[PDB]
Amino acid sequence: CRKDSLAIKLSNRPSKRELEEKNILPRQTDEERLELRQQIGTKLTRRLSQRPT
Amino acid sequence: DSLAIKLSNRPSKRELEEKNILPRQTDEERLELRQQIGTKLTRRLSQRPTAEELEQRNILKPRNEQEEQEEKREIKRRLTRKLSQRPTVEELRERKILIRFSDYVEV
Amino acid sequence: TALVCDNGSGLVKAGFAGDDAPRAVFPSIVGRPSYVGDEAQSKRGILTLKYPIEHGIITNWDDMEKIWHHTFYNELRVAPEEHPTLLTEAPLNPKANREKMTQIMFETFNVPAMYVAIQAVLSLYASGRTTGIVLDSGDGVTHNVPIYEGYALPHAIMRLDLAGRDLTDYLMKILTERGYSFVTTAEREIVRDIKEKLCYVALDFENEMATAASSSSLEKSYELPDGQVITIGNERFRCPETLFQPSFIGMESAGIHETTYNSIMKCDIDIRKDLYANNVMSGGTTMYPGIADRMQKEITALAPSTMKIKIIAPPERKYSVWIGGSILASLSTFQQMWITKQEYDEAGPSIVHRKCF
Amino acid sequence: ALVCDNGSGLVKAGFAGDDAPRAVFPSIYPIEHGIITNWDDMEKIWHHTFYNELRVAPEEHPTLLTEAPLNPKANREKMTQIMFETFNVPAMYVAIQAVLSLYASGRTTGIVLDSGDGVTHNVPIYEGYALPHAIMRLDLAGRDLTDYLMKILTERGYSFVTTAEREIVRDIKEKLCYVALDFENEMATAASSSSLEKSYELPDGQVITIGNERFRCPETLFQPSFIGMESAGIHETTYNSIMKCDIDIRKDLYANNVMSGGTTMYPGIADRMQKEITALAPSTMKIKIIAPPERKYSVWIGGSILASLSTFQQMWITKQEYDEAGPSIVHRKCF
Amino acid sequence: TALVCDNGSGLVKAGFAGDDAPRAVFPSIVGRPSYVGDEAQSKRGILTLKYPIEHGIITNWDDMEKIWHHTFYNELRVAPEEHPTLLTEAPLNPKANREKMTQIMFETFNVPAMYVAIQAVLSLYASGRTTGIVLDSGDGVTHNVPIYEGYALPHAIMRLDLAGRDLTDYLMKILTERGYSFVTTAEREIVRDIKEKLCYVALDFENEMATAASSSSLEKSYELPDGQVITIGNERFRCPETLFQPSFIGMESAGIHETTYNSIMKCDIDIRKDLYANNVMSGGTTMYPGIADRMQKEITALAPSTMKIKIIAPPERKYSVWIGGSILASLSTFQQMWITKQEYDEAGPSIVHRKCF
Amino acid sequence: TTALVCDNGSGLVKAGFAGDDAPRAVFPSIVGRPRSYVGDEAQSKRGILTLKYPIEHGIITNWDDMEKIWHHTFYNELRVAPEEHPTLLTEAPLNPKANREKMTQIMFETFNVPAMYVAIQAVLSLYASGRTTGIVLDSGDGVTHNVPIYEGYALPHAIMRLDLAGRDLTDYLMKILTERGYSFVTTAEREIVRDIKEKLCYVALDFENEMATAASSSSLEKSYELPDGQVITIGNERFRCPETLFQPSFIGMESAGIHETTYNSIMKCDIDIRKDLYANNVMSGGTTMYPGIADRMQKEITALAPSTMKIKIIAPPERKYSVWIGGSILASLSTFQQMWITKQEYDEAGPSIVHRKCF
Amino acid sequence: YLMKILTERGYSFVTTAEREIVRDIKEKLCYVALDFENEMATAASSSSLEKSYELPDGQVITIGNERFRCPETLFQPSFIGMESAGIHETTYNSIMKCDIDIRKDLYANNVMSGGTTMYPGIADRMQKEITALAPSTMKIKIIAPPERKYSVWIGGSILASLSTFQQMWITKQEYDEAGPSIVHRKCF
Numbered sequence A: 001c002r003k004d005s006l007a008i009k010l011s012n013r014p015s016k017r018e019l020e021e022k023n024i025l026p027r028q029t030d031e032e033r034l035e036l037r038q039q040i041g042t043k044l045t046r047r048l049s050q051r052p053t
Numbered sequence B: 001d002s003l004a005i006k007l008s009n010r011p012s013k014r015e016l017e018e019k020n021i022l023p024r025q026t027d028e029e030r031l032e033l034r035q036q037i038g039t040k041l042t043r044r045l046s047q048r049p050t051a052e053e054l055e056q057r058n059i060l061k062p063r064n065e066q067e068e069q070e071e072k073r074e075i076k077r078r079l080t081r082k083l084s085q086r087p088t089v090e091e092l093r094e095r096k097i098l099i100r101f102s103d104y105v106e107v
Numbered sequence C, E: 001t002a003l004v005c006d007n008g009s010g011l012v013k014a015g016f017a018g019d020d021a022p023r024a025v026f027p028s029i030v031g032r033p034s035y036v037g038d039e040a041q042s043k044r045g046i047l048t049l050k051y052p053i054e055h056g057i058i059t060n061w062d063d064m065e066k067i068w069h070h071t072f073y074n075e076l077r078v079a080p081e082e083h084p085t086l087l088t089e090a091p092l093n094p095k096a097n098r099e100k101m102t103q104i105m106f107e108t109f110n111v112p113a114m115y116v117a118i119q120a121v122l123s124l125y126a127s128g129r130t131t132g133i134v135l136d137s138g139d140g141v142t143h144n145v146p147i148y149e150g151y152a153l154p155h156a157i158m159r160l161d162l163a164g165r166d167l168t169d170y171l172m173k174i175l176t177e178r179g180y181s182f183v184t185t186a187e188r189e190i191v192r193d194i195k196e197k198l199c200y201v202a203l204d205f206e207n208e209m210a211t212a213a214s215s216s217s218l219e220k221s222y223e224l225p226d227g228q229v230i231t232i233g234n235e236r237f238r239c240p241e242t243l244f245q246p247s248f249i250g251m252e253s254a255g256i257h258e259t260t261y262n263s264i265m266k267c268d269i270d271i272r273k274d275l276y277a278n279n280v281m282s283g284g285t286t287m288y289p290g291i292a293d294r295m296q297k298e299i300t301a302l303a304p305s306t307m308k309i310k311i312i313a314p315p316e317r318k319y320s321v322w323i324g325g326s327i328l329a330s331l332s333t334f335q336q337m338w339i340t341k342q343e344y345d346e347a348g349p350s351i352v353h354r355k356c357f
Numbered sequence D: 001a002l003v004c005d006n007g008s009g010l011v012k013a014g015f016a017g018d019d020a021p022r023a024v025f026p027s028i029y030p031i032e033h034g035i036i037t038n039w040d041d042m043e044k045i046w047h048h049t050f051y052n053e054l055r056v057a058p059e060e061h062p063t064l065l066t067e068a069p070l071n072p073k074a075n076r077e078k079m080t081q082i083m084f085e086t087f088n089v090p091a092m093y094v095a096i097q098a099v100l101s102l103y104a105s106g107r108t109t110g111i112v113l114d115s116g117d118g119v120t121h122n123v124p125i126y127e128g129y130a131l132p133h134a135i136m137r138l139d140l141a142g143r144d145l146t147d148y149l150m151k152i153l154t155e156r157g158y159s160f161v162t163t164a165e166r167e168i169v170r171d172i173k174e175k176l177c178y179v180a181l182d183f184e185n186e187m188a189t190a191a192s193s194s195s196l197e198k199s200y201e202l203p204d205g206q207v208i209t210i211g212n213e214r215f216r217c218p219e220t221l222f223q224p225s226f227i228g229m230e231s232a233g234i235h236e237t238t239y240n241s242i243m244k245c246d247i248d249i250r251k252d253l254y255a256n257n258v259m260s261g262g263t264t265m266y267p268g269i270a271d272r273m274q275k276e277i278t279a280l281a282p283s284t285m286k287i288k289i290i291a292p293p294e295r296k297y298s299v300w301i302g303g304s305i306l307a308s309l310s311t312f313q314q315m316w317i318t319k320q321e322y323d324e325a326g327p328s329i330v331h332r333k334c335f
Numbered sequence F: 001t002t003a004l005v006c007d008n009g010s011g012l013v014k015a016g017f018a019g020d021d022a023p024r025a026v027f028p029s030i031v032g033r034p035r036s037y038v039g040d041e042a043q044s045k046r047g048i049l050t051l052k053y054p055i056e057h058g059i060i061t062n063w064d065d066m067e068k069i070w071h072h073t074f075y076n077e078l079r080v081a082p083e084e085h086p087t088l089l090t091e092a093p094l095n096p097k098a099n100r101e102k103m104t105q106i107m108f109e110t111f112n113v114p115a116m117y118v119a120i121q122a123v124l125s126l127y128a129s130g131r132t133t134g135i136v137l138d139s140g141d142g143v144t145h146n147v148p149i150y151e152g153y154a155l156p157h158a159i160m161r162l163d164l165a166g167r168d169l170t171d172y173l174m175k176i177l178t179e180r181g182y183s184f185v186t187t188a189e190r191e192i193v194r195d196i197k198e199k200l201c202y203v204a205l206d207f208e209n210e211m212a213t214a215a216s217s218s219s220l221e222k223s224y225e226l227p228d229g230q231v232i233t234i235g236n237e238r239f240r241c242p243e244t245l246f247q248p249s250f251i252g253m254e255s256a257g258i259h260e261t262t263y264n265s266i267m268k269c270d271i272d273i274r275k276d277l278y279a280n281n282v283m284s285g286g287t288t289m290y291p292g293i294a295d296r297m298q299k300e301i302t303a304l305a306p307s308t309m310k311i312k313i314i315a316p317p318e319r320k321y322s323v324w325i326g327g328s329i330l331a332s333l334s335t336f337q338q339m340w341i342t343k344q345e346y347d348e349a350g351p352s353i354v355h356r357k358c359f
Numbered sequence G: 001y002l003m004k005i006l007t008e009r010g011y012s013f014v015t016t017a018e019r020e021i022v023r024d025i026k027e028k029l030c031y032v033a034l035d036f037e038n039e040m041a042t043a044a045s046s047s048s049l050e051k052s053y054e055l056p057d058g059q060v061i062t063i064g065n066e067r068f069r070c071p072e073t074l075f076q077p078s079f080i081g082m083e084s085a086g087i088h089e090t091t092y093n094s095i096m097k098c099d100i101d102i103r104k105d106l107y108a109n110n111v112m113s114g115g116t117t118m119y120p121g122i123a124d125r126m127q128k129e130i131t132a133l134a135p136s137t138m139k140i141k142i143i144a145p146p147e148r149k150y151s152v153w154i155g156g157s158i159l160a161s162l163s164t165f166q167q168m169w170i171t172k173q174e175y176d177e178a179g180p181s182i183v184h185r186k187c188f
């Protein structure tokens, strides 16, 4: 029945980890995301400033 | 008959790793870990503050407890003494110490 | 505020510099009785649809101008003359092609500034690196691009015309062999969704085939829009297996691990260690669960026994190209890097080669 | 198995496999805004549920309880502790209300708007998983609508101050209120003619006439400023919740808006929600609003379904497991 | 046993009279969806947080009541009706404000007795003095308070809205300029710790700048929570230099040495000698190594050539204010000084002005 | 040149080479004389000859016997020439000045070492985990200490000492097993019980609840087969035994438990470093090997500390020997090579030099 | 030497790992100044020559004149307390010890090989110094290909792959006949 479409759908549901890797459930705060993006940005500006010809 | 008894008392694999019986990491892993710890230790011991530098931060006091007690006693004495001889707002006014009348008026 | 435009063979990703994710993502199609992207797909029944970008290279300039127009006006709702624009390009993009991109950006859309960055390079930047080897696998094309100090190494670049679209097609074929019929475009979209939701890369392919034949542990169920229910078994991992064994679709080409290794080997030996320790995966076709572990295993199998191997595959990687651009265009030191309208007026299409490298 | 939906206003309780709850009764206030705050009173409520309403022995049935979105870890831990220690159940489970509502419609992916007596939530859910970062909470619900209706009825010239009178006003709200598709046009229509007017017969046999109030009352859900709140309306919170989710699942969320709870029972609410969400979303986005007739109890229904599935049987927390892990176990076993 | 409560702009210090150190020290914040201090900060994401004391003066009384309740019940685990209570107040605290403090203490918490003391005065008392000039620099505000025989001299008090928080922000700015990124609140906390552990006050700023430009001898390393390591150079001494050169953060104000001098000059000439020979430093922002010596140098540079200058800066100074209270409330002769609850009914809020000075 | 590391326990000496991951030789600290053998050999001949304990509660009290132990360590166990190796020794917290001076004198004059160093056990324990700041709970055979350390400096004013350790736990286990009706009065019986303690004991997370579990079912019961082939069943004794560490009143002691002493030690330190102490509790010593002790300590410390304080208990599986490991690391650092007290320096300053040079 | 001068700067590089890091700094950032005094003056005048290196721990250090002072030792060995002539002077001396007739052929063919010749600018500096030492009319050519770090090996790879080389190998049989002695006749 409809409870069979539901039973077949419930049986299929992935782990929380699986959603996490699929970027459906984030692994960090928007703040932490900001930290990371900032660090990346500064490292990048440094290496680019040093970048050889 | 003894076997089954010994089989009922079997630890979990985790519980064995807890006793440092089963390694939780490869030899190479333990080595890299040791090297890391070592470099950390080196760096920290390099910038290790001095005894005086750690005294001034109030981390560890030099004076014995009795010495401290003597300090906290002498201070209380001098304080009660100095506070029981505390001039009136008028004495300070008259001596140009207080410049405004509104200051400590309600005393 | 600067704009970032990643021109995919399948999907255009567009947005504003400084943002963590693209504001608009839409299929790169042009429909004529003009409709672009989602609207074209909606009107797909009434009119035939054409792909302006095939295998990562722009081939139809009128349609591309249509796509960019839709991007600026319909999707982002901005005036192009008010924003510096960073565009992406494929590895080994021909000189004339990028020249035409620059010319169109300045003359047609009157942007105050623009820049053209290599997709794989942006992918590398998004992870905060300037040296490493990128596997960029999208909808239309797959690349291995080794990069040192921001410079792509052209002689060691590998191009493979096997990507996500091809995997979708293969999945349609094998599902059909199982007995479910998927010939129409709408059915194709359904199969693509099945691929994205249910497919994964087996760590050991033979063992996984044996497991799939031995039991129902791998079987999954998909409910069609008609409410019909279908069961998918080994197709889950046989589909993306094509990346490692292109012979599944009749290609003589080596798999992505072999092309990664070969690309690494074509580079100077001294930087090779740096390349092995920095494998960045980007693009939608790298989103399959288990692909990083399989790549680790294969690269480990090909490389020297003592070589350090590291695969970088963040969950956000499907859009990482764009993210890189988003970071790059928001850096203060990048502001000088832009090609200004005055400079373009002075040097013409030629300036992009000098300014961008 | 038993199924218990612990509402701020109404407790819905019954047996698994049944189409409707056997017992529905006011929660008298131990639960405010969907979260349990008075534990002694809550224990009283659960006792009343087991013994008086359902006439069962708690030790003989696995028990599924519902909880609010963003329910604190300690709170569900206390629920579990009381269920196992006080009532000695052989098994129990704690499910998110919005998730059960979603399951009740045969879905495991979509976005639920759950509006009850005390609190309203937007909960986007993917593969049975609620996405905590994207959940929206709005402290505007049925009770507030009842109060607002009392105020506007006062503007009509009818006096409704007593609690019993409040209950009467609530019934008036349930029977005569509706959500206007276009609020301004409906106001103009209400001012132009008696076409919108309705009559309610009081118990004393007095008859009253209600005009634009019929749609001004639930309009508060879309315009909370009607009661002095600075918060956005339910359509905007639906949109915002959707926007906080990953772009790839966003399409899946738009095509699956499930509405549940008593405060979603207003006629016309689905059409209005459709219009507003269409107005906020991208022009080509497919929008579908799901609002079944059973929605007033759909949460409970979901539980009733879930607890009757064979595959759910492994999911129960057994009394032995609770004995082994304590309150901690609920977090691992239920998700 | 009496209680002692120092209501700081950043940190509340609370404890029992006679104790060497405060039993509880926690940030003075109030959280609403009630939460106080650290617990409010952990849950800071879920609920908005409000600062009841800004620049040393109480502005939000409900929030202050929340802080005091948390202090009595949660932190000290005592019944307020069972203990006389000494509160601290800022220099130049408005009359109505201290009246409200008194009113709330007696009516809301039903204390048997209480007293309100000026922070700088308590700082002076803690060193066993009743005459001298105090520099009390905390989280939100810095004061110079000249005191003669226990009397603060209101006409000569200096207020400077430059303190620890401003220094933390500045350190974030200059470390960011160095290329380590510190924009977030968690990063801000990290920077505060960096400031407390690695910063110091240069005796000669220009010479120290020259040494810093000449070599890496001054550079130090800080280990982030993720175990990543960062380097701090001249920022170590440029940060607290702001106290002497407020122009570093765009302030036109004179430095703390100049305000000390001006405060001393605003006093009657006869007591001036007594002020110069007794500079007591209190508050967290005086904890920088080298600050006493620098202050000695600058004050010597400003004062008459034959004037005796003595800077008193004990290791415990960060809490000396509280300590002073702890001493004061434990003196036998102080027992008469308390405002009794009966006394409060008789005179009302008015009584605090007469009884406490 | 390879340095040596010697951890002088009240019960067990751990000895080995710097740079090694684990001690080469671990043996009981006993000296046997006819009514000379050291350690295991002494234990085997224990019947024939009387035994003396050179180290009691972590502090050296019998120097001749200690010299015998050190000789046995160098020659019999490690097979080295002491004059050919720098030597790092460990000492107990609050070790008297004269005691460490005597250690130095004996090392240089008797064993003719080219260099040596004396380190606090708890400090080395902290170092083995790559830390220089934190609070160590070091519980061995004869004595237990809480030692707070900031930047490598032990804070003497805040050190807590508890004369309740592994041996006392063995005795208590003997007593409670005896109350059950199994007789363990004899020394051999003491050894079997000690093995029982090591194999079957653990620390309950909630002591009362675990007692209730033990009373409710046979689920906690385990079986141990004695050498005589007799089989015994053990229930709550499994967790009642190490509970003594948290409740010393179990053996008639008035002292606070280890969690309370940890808290007190933390409180005796300056408030500013206190946060750093709470986040770095390192457990070391054999008596910390009980499963569940870290979790219990976490719960109790969280219960005593302010509600929002971050608490982290560090208890690696190797912790039983972590002291030694620390020394092994410390003595293997390149930057440590200057830190050694050289024999020339000792010739110049005498026993006095150790105080200045080691801290 | 680079470790020594960086240490003099206030960066501590005592450990072996630190030595490896310094080696990496040398390989990545060092170069040979064409005019050493002028480069010292430029380094003293501005931050233009300064470069930045990020340590593995993420620590960041700044390196200035050490970039060219380090390999300058090759031209001025006295920098490390050696009395020896520099590589240019030893090149010149080597050329002079050869017959005069071949000197022209030697001057026109200076081949540089090995890792320590990888410093940018070393070929140009060598050109300048040798030009300064040689007769005014002598043709000087310095050959320093990018592959030079491995050119030794490369040469071998080529030599052993030549067809005409096939007779040149010392066979196991020949070794059996003559012993270790055979290498002298066969290899030259």
Ligand SMILES: Nc1ncnc2c1ncn2[C@@H]1O[C@H](COP(=O)(O)OP(=O)(O)OP(=O)(O)O)[C@@H](O)[C@H]1O
Binding pocket: C007, C008, C009, C010, C011, C012, C055, C056, C136, C137, C138, C139, C140, C141, C142, C163, C164, C165, C168, C192, C195, C196, C197, C282, C283, C284, C285, C286, C287, C288, C318
């Ligand atoms: N979760 C997923 N798992 C597997 N494949 C996915 C997933 N999501 C998207 N894809 C595939 O990725 C492809 C889109 O990738 P991407 O957007 O990187 O391509 P593109 O950039 O448009 O093309 P190109 O890189 O060739 O220019 C689609 O064909 C789709 O089938």
Ligand SMILES: Nc1ncnc2c1ncn2[C@@H]1O[C@H](COP(=O)(O)OP(=O)(O)OP(=O)(O)O)[C@@H](O)[C@H]1O
Binding pocket: D006, D007, D008, D009, D010, D011, D033, D034, D115, D116, D117, D118, D119, D120, D141, D142, D143, D146, D170, D173, D174, D175, D177, D260, D261, D262, D263, D264, D265, D266, D296
């Ligand atoms: N037909 C109707 N029209 C309008 N409102 C209705 C109708 N039926 C019920 N309601 C309102 O719905 C509310 C009851 O809904 P429900 O029992 O789902 O809330 P709840 O789940 O107890 O609340 P919460 O989820 O906050 O705990 C009542 O306040 C009632 O006024």
Ligand SMILES: Nc1ncnc2c1ncn2[C@@H]1O[C@H](COP(=O)(O)OP(=O)(O)OP(=O)(O)O)[C@@H](O)[C@H]1O
Binding pocket: E007, E008, E009, E010, E011, E012, E055, E056, E137, E138, E139, E140, E141, E142, E163, E164, E165, E168, E192, E195, E196, E197, E282, E283, E284, E285, E286, E287, E288, E318
């Ligand atoms: N060792 C240290 N070195 C430098 N600064 C420190 C040190 N310790 C604390 N601080 C700073 O001192 C400030 C807190 O000082 P204090 O507790 O005296 O302020 P307060 O009394 O709460 O503020 P106010 O006096 O304005 O009410 C914090 O901003 C902190 O960064």
Ligand SMILES: Nc1ncnc2c1ncn2[C@@H]1O[C@H](COP(=O)(O)OP(=O)(O)OP(=O)(O)O)[C@@H](O)[C@H]1O
Binding pocket: B019, F008, F009, F010, F011, F012, F013, F055, F057, F058, F139, F140, F141, F142, F143, F144, F165, F166, F167, F170, F194, F197, F198, F199, F201, F285, F286, F287, F288, F289, F290, F320
């Ligand atoms: N797995 C285990 N479980 C419980 N206790 C154990 C375990 N392993 C060893 N022990 C106990 O640890 C003790 C040994 O500790 P250790 O060798 O650290 O003491 P020590 O260093 O000789 O003494 P001190 O530190 O007082 O000088 C023994 O008494 C033993 O009973």
Ligand SMILES: [Mg+2]
Binding pocket: C006, C007, C008, C119, C136, C138, C283, C321
């Ligand atoms: Mg792409």
Ligand SMILES: [Mg+2]
Binding pocket: D007, D097, D114, D115, D116, D261, D299
């Ligand atoms: Mg509900």
Ligand SMILES: [Mg+2]
Binding pocket: E008, E119, E136, E137, E138, E283, E321
């Ligand atoms: Mg203060």
Ligand SMILES: [Mg+2]
Binding pocket: F009, F121, F138, F139, F140, F284, F285, F286, F323
């Ligand atoms: Mg020990």
